[PDB]
Structure formats: structure tokens, C-alpha cells
Amino acid sequence: ASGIYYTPKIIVDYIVKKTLKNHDIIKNPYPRILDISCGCGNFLLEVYDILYDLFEENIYELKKKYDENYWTVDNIHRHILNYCIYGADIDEKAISILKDSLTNKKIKINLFCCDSLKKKWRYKFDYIVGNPPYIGHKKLEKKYKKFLLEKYSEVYKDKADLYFCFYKKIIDILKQGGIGSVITPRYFLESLSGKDLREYIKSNVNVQEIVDFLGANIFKNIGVSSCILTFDKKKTKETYIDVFKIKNEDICINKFETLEELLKSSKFEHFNINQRLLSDEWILVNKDDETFYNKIQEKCKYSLEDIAISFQGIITGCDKAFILSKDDVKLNLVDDKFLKCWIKSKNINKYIVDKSEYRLIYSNDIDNENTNKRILDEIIGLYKTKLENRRECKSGIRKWYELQWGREKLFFERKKIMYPYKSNENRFAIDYDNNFSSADVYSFFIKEEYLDKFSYEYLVGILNSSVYDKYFKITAKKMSKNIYDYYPNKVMKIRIFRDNNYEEIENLSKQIISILLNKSIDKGKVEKLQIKMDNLIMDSLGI
Template sequence: MKEFIPGKLYQQSMEKDSKKANGRFYTPDYIIDFMLARVFSNVNIIENPFIKILDPACGCGFFLIKAYDLLKEMLKSNLEKIREKYSDETYETNKDGYVIKINGKQYWQEKNLHYHILKNCLYGADTDKEALGLCSASLLAKDNNDYKDELNLVCGDSLFRWEKYYCREQLVDELENYKLIYDIKNSRDHTVEHVTRDRLKEILRNNMFWSNKFDYIIGNPPYVGHKELNMEYKKWLLDEYNETFKDKSDLSYCFYQRALEVAEDKGIIGFVSSRYFMESPTGRNLRRYLKNNSRINNIVDFYGETIFPGVGVAAAIFFISNEVDNNNEIEVWKYQGNGFNKLEHKDFQIFKINQDSITEDRWILIPNEERRILEKIENGCTKRLGDMAESFQGIITGCDKAFIIDNDTIKTLGIEAELIKPWIKNSHVDRYRVRNSNLKLIYSDLIDDPSRYPNSIMHIEKYKQRLENRRECKKGLRLWYQLQWGRKTELFTKEKIVFPYKSTCNRFALDRRGCFCSADVYSFILKDGVGCCSLPFLLGVLNSRLYEFYFKLFAKKMGKDIYDYYPNTVMDLKIPDYKACKDIEAISLELIRLYEEDADSKRISILEKEIDDILRSYFSIRKEALSLK
């Protein structure tokens, strides 16, 4: 199989910002090969040699080019049987620019396969004309036989329902007359559009293209976050795709709904996309839509492993079919390897879950044994952490060099003491304790009169130009010497539990020193009126091995062994009854002391095991089930 160099060069030449804005990222060959192999595994080319394959965001055509090779090989291998089965059928073909009719014996010849595949089987759409041009050139170059017809490639937004909002008869009638401007009806907006002849032809081509139903839809729909979307287009999506798209949704969500709309009954869809919708609040609509409107056949979850070079998108592959099956079992492949350039069974944990077991709250992809443990924990508690605690993020300075200093700098510059606050970052947060930090924060939001704090102002002023360029300063929301987001001082001065926003394991610490935290640290305090609970008790629960296991069952994985400890997820943890597990509090207080003293690890291990034993007993979980020794 020849490697398609022009398309790859085109992808590589695109600026990084342009790729991000348009959501265009090159799909590695081994991912394309894997997806096509899975999709084509149930193709019966003899029964249906006219299968329609669509890539709705085809770009340079990497999926279509490889699909061409697979189709041609399948057709060649079965050509004799196909010719025999359809020998008496009549087919149209293009010879020297003229459409002629021939019988099946003449049509089903190897020399005609190039024409057949391009004319009847491969369909691609994209908004990038240059990429489509490369796709077209690459497909045409697949065979030395000339292809005289138009390829099934259209330039336009695949999310627009061309087949629904334009009347083909009116478009055809309009084209019969030559005009400078044509008036065509758009039934979606109930308006009349004034377009040129070329635009009218483009609309007609899209209308005819999207009137097809497709047997297989495959590709890498663009990942475009809500911040990158044009405001008008976002409003249109919120209206047009209200079943799947919410205010902070990704553009790729809409492609799932659109694919199901244009797929044949029981048609197969294979998309590689961000896995984030399985867990995010804004993915709720899409989760509900897919569960209720499709049969989810297979999910290949890369579980935070990077598969797109240079792109920090946690991806998964979703194979679904256009049918509803309430008793369906989803085959899940969960990546367990250490980096790859091909997909092999040995690198995945493979298991099945019932489609009914996934909820719109969150898709948790775990084997049945782990699901039973999860259910014991969830059903054994009445309250979530968010019912008892209030979480908040650390401070965003907008320029750490201006506000974060060490003790030596404070002495040298004579920074005013009343502005100085203890400062910690992610690296200072350990299990049960906050490590000592030599860093301090100039909490400049306390400056009411700059003339009273000349030394602090003199230091901060070194970075004035950069500080003034902060968005909040440009909008007049913050003074140049203030912190970008200073939060409320009373939140930091209270006794609180702090934890890093990303970590390989549960790292919750009790802060009694009133540390101010950077943005890569989150904290929580007890809500007013919360009785029969304490921060040391919660600390012991959250740092337990059982709760680390529990958290990782549904936490978002950000990379190899790195998990996202975003408060939405942490606050969703169910917490056991305080009175029934009260002994954890005293053990936790002892662990705090031992960790602060760097005590013998053997004693620490014994106490931590005691907490796990209490929790396992409370939830009736066997020790062997978690391999907790």
C-alpha cells in the first residue's frame, strides 16, 4: 500500500493554532488500520458490493484512501462470485466520457473496480477545499485507468442538514435558467437566500450527497471546544443539535448525532474522538442520546495515553450501530500498556458491560467485579462529599514572578509583612501533610493605597507591562498590581483539606497553617451546620487505598498513571457514615502526626491498613476483591 505523502505534508504544514481552532489532527495510520479492520469485519461484499462508506470530516482523505485499498482487495478476492451472482444485472458506467449500459459479466471485471469504488462506494465531506483537493488527487491516482465522473466529495458543513432544508426540485429548476443571482428557499430559517450560480451548484451537490444513507461512517470528527467556536455558529449548534450539544460541549458531539441520522438501518459508525464526553457534565446529553438511540458495540479507551502526536487529547474509539438494543453488551478495551505504535490485545484489559449499566451521569467502564464493589460503596452511603464540603481552586496570579517570592527576597526588598502569605504548590501536597515551603505570596489585593506599600509596588512594577496585558486588566476589572484571581482570603485561612489537581494517587493533606495555594491545588472546607463529621475523618477516608481504588474507577485519566482530581469528581465521592466509622478519625490524627515527624513507615503502614479494614468491613468488601494486603 502506497503511503500518502501530500496529505501528511499538508497536515504538518498547518499552524498549531489553526489545527486547534479547526479541530484537525492527523490520525495515526495504525489507528486508521485498526478502525477499518473492525468496521470491515462484518462486510458481506458479495451480498452488497455497492456499500457506501462516508467520512464526514475527511480532510486529506486518510480514512478513504485506506478504505479504497481494503475494498479493492475484497472485491478482487470475490470477483468471480460477484460476477456470477449479478451476471444478468444491468449497470451504468462511464466510457470515454459517455454513460453506457453493460451487463454484469462485463461490469464485474478487475479493470472496472477503480471506477466502481470511486463512483459508488466512497463518500467524503469537509469544509477545507485544499484538503479535499488532495483527497481527490490521491483517490484518482490509485489506478492508471482514467476516471471521468465526479468523485463523491463535497465541500460544506456536514452538520448542516442539506437534504432537509433545501428542495432539490427547486434547485434544479433554478439552474435551468442563467442568472447573475438566484433566489433559493431555506426551509430551516424560512428565508430566501440570494446566491451565485456556483454556490447554487454547491448547495445542490450537498443536497444530493446528503440524501444518501450510508452503510459505514468512519473518521476522526473535529475536536473544537466551545471557546474556539464562533459565537453565531455556537448559537446555531445549540438550536440545531439541542439533543446532544450544550453550552460548553465540543463540536465533535454533534457528529455522532448527525452520523446516526444519515446511517442506514443497522449501519455502523466508527469514530475516534475525545473520551471526555463519557465523564464531563457537558457530555450528559450526548451520553443519553447514544444510549437511547444506538447500539454501542465497542469502546476502545486509551485511558489517557496520547495517540495524537503533539496533542493533549485523551481519546477513545467508539463503534456504534444505528439500532436500539436494550439487552446489548458493550465490548470494552481498556488500555493497560506503556506506549504503542500499534494496537494489540495484550495491551488491553478486555471485558463486557451491559449497555443498560451505563448512565447519563457518567459512563464508568469497569468489569462486573469492580462494578459490584462500586455499587457496594455507592449504595452503602447516603451522602456525597459535596453535601458536606465546599471546594475552591487556588489563586491565579497572572504572573507568578511578580507575586511569588522566597524569604531571602522578602528580607532583601523589605516587602511589607502584612501582605505576605504562606504559599504552596502541587509539589508541596503530600498524603496527610503539607510539606514546608520557602515560597511566599505577595497578596496585593490587600493594597488599598499603593503609597503605603512602596517596596511591594516597586517589586511588582518590574512586571507592569505583562500584568497590564492580562485580560482582566484590559477590561478594567483588575488594577495592574492586583492578582488575576485572588479568591477570598478567609477561605485559605480556615482549616482545610488540600489536594493537587492532578496526581498518580490520592494525596489529601490537612492544612492548619493557613496556606495560600496556587491554581494547581484545590481545597475544601466543611460547610456550615455539618454535624457528626470532621476534616481528619474525611482525610483518613480519602487517603485510604479503598478510596483511591474507588476514585480511579471513574476518574478522568490525563496521561500515563496521571489522574484528574477536578473537584466535580472528588466532590461526587460517596462518604461512609461518620458514627459507624468514627475510629478512622483518631487513626487519621495519629497519621498526621507521624507523617509530619517523618516517622517509621512500618507504623504508618499498620495504621493505614486499619483504616482500610474499617472501610472494607463497613462496605462488606472482601480483602481479596481489591488485592489489599
């Protein structure tokens, strides 16, 4: 809740250098560089140093070209503090610290203590740098969210993040021909909520460079994945984007004195993306991956959304009140008609699900409060207060002992395919035990009209293959290190096929399932069967 995050000095140096590398101080000796979330001025002090070097090295040229008495080395500090540096933040103390630092670098200092999203900006800016705040839909005040929805509807909507509005504000107050460079989360590149935002960035600025750190850790002790976006508003004929994607997420960012050394090394991969060819999604991949993805998309006639019905797991609202161990003695109080098997994301393997260790009390079947009063008095009631603070319980839609978002039972108590919402690899398992789960596991079942065309065994055989792992990870949402988001908004967009290899792929999947379900489970032959199935799928897809 402090609101101030230290951006590493390497990133700050890289961003400032990216914005001010090729600035013609002779042509324009009055550049306006702004940081709308400056905090203690990590970016602004480096901006001051760079500007001081520029002015000191061109002071005599400026003196000849302009007022001789005005352009002096002794007057550089005052000029920079008067006409060049602009900062804004909400923290009074951080603004005071930055003001003290700028004063002690050697006068009206242009530092503002306000909300940058509400401030009426009196002029546009040549350069904009900084690190905006990241606040999700849970940790954001509701009235402020209403304000954002009312005024920033072009980029902010539904489950959008706060920094979308900061992106929009940076684009709005950027002078024509100006350059902006910021560090933000990487999720908006692939997230559904970022769609509108991406469109905005596509339709108002030219994207110069995207530095994607994927799942690395740039901020110490902070669970966020970061990217650096550099863009301009110049008159460009061809709009191409230099995309730099990290290859090894196990790095210490201080491996080099400069970020450019890391970018131009074997630790990063560079390619080019045509901005005019960008779709609703931004598919930032190299030529090989692009050809692979296009070949898979063309060769497949169906998608999972076409043939399957998907749903999210139960949302109890308070798991500690409804989930218990199968060996718990309190379960003797509850009849088996109210008990469902309960699995977690770690219980999902590639083809089969681990046997259930937990039981869920489906309290929605409790008809009368007086009946089964022992269960409410000794199990569910222990968290009654918490259960009463849920949104649907304050409004009277749910009884305090009911599940907040208990779905239809008929969807879970059937044969279906389940997969964790976050994983390092594809894990699509067939559930035979009518397992219930929380939102950490998503489920789907084949529509009855496609049962003859696609079976569960074939689907899990092709989905768990390395080919489809790579194919899904092309457009997947990279959350953290070795973690991808497996949500319906991208899982249901996977495209599938059927051809002459359907029978052998299904048979190999059945053999793998049979081996995995045996007692003396030696998974060695499973790998060989998987390799054979991968070769079959690669032959089928022409790759």
C-alpha cells in the same frame, strides 16, 4: 495549527474492518462510506482497498445478478470512485493530495472542501469513519463558538469540545441500519461537559463497542487520551456494549500486526455493559468493580457535598506578577499584611502539606494606587501589559494590579483539607498554615453543623485509604498516563460513612499525622498504620 494528525495504521485498519467486515455487497453494491475529517485520506485509501477486494471477489456474482456489461474488473475503480467514497475537510491541500492518491489508485471524485458542521448534506450514509478535530474551549474562535451554541445546543454547551458536534453530525447523517466507527478523546465518557453528548449517543444509536486506551499514548508526541467508539442504527432487541479497557498503559501499539490481537490478549480486559441501564454517567466497569462500587454507595449515608463546602484556589491571571520566592529581596518592599503562603500541587502529600516555598501578594488589599507605589512600580508593574489584557481588566471590573479571581480570604485562612487537581492517587491533606494556592489545588472545609459528626482527621484517614482510592478511580476522569482529574464535580460526590470504627480510624489517622510531622521522620510505621486502617475500612464497608 496544522489541523492534520496521522492516525496509526493499526487503528485505521481496525476501524475500517469494524465497519466493513460483514457488508453484503451482493444485496447492496452501492454503499456510501464517508469521512468528514479525512485530511490526507488515511481512512479513505484503506476503504478503497477493502472495497476493491470485495468487488473483485464477488464480481461474477454481481455480473449474474445485475447488468453484465457494467460489473467488470476494469470498471471497479470507476464505480468505487463514483458511488462509494465520500470525504470532506477544510484543508484544500490535503483534499488535493487525497484526490491525487485516489486518481493514482489505478471520474467524479466526491471530495468536499468545506466545514462539515455547516455543510448542507444532500443524503445520508451507510458507513462513517474518521478522526474528527479536537478543539477545547480555549483554542476555539468565539464567533464559531456562538454558532456552535446556537445550532449544536443538544451536545455543545459551556466547556464542551468541538468533537461533540462531530459526534452529533455523524449520528444525524447516518442511514438507518448504518454503522459508524470513530476515534475521539476518552474524556467525554466521564467529563461533566459530555453529559448531554452521552445522552444523545444513548438515545439515538446503539453503541456496539468502546475501546478505551485510558492513559496510553496512541498519537506520538501528542498529549491526548484516545478511545474508539463503534455504534449502529440497526433494529436491535437487546442493546449490550462490548467494553474493552486496557490494563497496562506502558505499551507500544505496534506490538501486534492487528489491533484485534491486542484486544484479545492479556493486555486488555473485556466486559459487557447494558446500554438500557446507563445513567447520566457511564460507569464502565466489570462485575467485581460494579459490586464494589454499589456496596460502597449503598453502605454510605452521607456525601462530601452534604457535609462540606468546597472551593477552587486563587486565579491571579498572571502568576509571574504576584508569586515570588520567599527568599526574594523584592519581598522586603511588601508589608507582611499583603503576603500569603503559596503552595503548588506537588506540595500536597497524603496527610500533610509541604512547608510553603512561595509567597503571594494579595494585591486586592492595595487601597490607593499612590500608596504602596513602590510595589506597583518594581514588582507588579513589570507585567502590566499582560495584566491589562485580562478580560476583567479590559472591561474595567478589575484594576490592572488586582488579582483577577482572588476569592474570599476567610475561606483559605482556616483549617481545611486541600488536594491536587491532578494526581495518580488520593492525596487529601490537612492544612494548618492557612496556605493559599492556585487552581491546581482545590480546598474544602466541613460545615459547622457536621463538625461533631465528622473531623478532618477521620476524613483524611478514610479518603487516603486504598479502598477510597479505588472507589474514586472507578468513576474518575482519566486525563493522561498516571493522571486522574481530582475536581469538585467528582470529588464532592464521594460518599462517606461513620460507624463503630470511627474512633480507631481517627486515632490511626492522628498517629500517622503525628509521625509525618516529626523531625526524624521514618515513614515506615506509617505504612503499617495505613494497612491497619485499610483493614478497618474494609471491615466497615463489608468488602
